Design a protein around this nucleic acid. Structure first.
Lengths: 23, 90, 90
DNA sequence: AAAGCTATTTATAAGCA
DNA sequence: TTGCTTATAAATAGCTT
């Protein structure tokens, strides 16, 4: 039963700039 | 389940917490299955009232979310309503 | 199902396509249920071999993923590798 | 790849250990 | 909670065609 850290630290960054500009 | 239950915010906070845990697992289980059976990548993101984040990834959330930056055109998107809707319609 | 099936890449491309569609739906169905039952937000991202994107969102996909990006605290994060084991137990 | 139809396998509300 | 146990409700593999 393994938990863990946030999913990513960098990718999350790239994902965001995208989501926002998607507007 | 030993008795049929409608789908609406479980009131008893005790039972609404036992169920969240039980199902959340089953959901991820099926995700995982669909993932292996049909050889496809899947990301699953859950958020509870307390905004506690829960997630799954057939391999790595990194790959998928990143791989979702390129092909952003959803050949199929659904809202809670589509499902609710498509539930009666058929 | 009328017969028990192991979980491994369905070989017959015909059957591996009939199953993807059937399950994908059920998965989203449960997502939706978990969503309403336990009042929580969920994003579901699927990618098939042909990289065709399929997705679901209890309400809005952009919202969930955003909230996600700005989420640095820790949380539950599973995989199939993980899930497989958690299953090898019960 | 498309719809129904069981026969069965799963998933799980309640129980109660 | 902290779980395991077990009737029922559900999901669905494999057939028609």
């Amino acid at each position: 039963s393994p938990k863990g850290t946030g999913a990513s630290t960098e990718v999350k960054q790239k994902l965001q700039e995208f989501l926002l500009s998607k507007s | 389940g030993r008795k049929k239950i409608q789908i609406s915010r479980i009131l008893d906070q005790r039972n609404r917490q036992v169920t969240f845990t039980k199902r959340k697992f089953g959901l991820m289980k099926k995700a995982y299955e669909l993932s292996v059976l049909c050889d496809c990548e899947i990301a699953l993101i859950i958020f509870n009232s307390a905004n506690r984040l829960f997630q799954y990834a057939s391999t790595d959330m990194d790959r998928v979310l990143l791989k979702y930056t390129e092909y952003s055109e959803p050949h199929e998107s659904r809202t809670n309503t589509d499902i609710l809707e498509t539930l009666k319609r058929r």
